């Protein structure tokens, strides 16, 4: 008797967990990614304004 009950109890929550983790992951990593892709571009930018002021002033 007891065997099959524990087999079901494992499988049901398992499925919850793994999907809820799969959802949560992709949301977070991309919304994070969204902003990382900024940050990359734009860093370049501030550098060149910084640099210009030195460069001309020299």
């Amino acid at each position: 008797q007891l065997e099959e009950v524990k087999q079901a109890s494992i499988k049901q929550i398992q499925d919850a967990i793994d999907m809820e983790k799969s959802q949560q992951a992709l949301v977070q990593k991309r919304h994070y990614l969204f902003d990382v892709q900024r940050n990359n571009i734009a860093m370049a930018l501030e550098v060149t304004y910084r640099e210009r002021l030195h460069r001309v002033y020299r």
Binding site: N40, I41, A44, V47, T48, E51, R52, R55, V56
Partner: protein, 66 residues
């Protein structure tokens, strides 16, 4: 003392005699120019031959991404 400062004088009256002569290779002979040209050229070296007499212009630029 103004035999002393006669000579401070005496050179300073050629402060004025030469300065109000001209001064350069002048009161003084060619010699100055013959260096001068080279020495001011060294200044051109001292800045590089980047023209120290033309207003410079400035970089418009981009580093790399994906």
């Amino acid at each position: 003392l103004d035999p002393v400062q006669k000579l401070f004088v005496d050179k300073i009256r050629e402060y004025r005699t030469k300065r109000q002569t001209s001064g350069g290779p002048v009161d003084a002979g060619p010699e100055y120019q013959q260096d001068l040209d080279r020495e001011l050229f060294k200044l051109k070296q001292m800045y590089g031959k980047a023209d120290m007499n033309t207003f410079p212009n400035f970089t418009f630029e981009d580093p790399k991404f994906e």
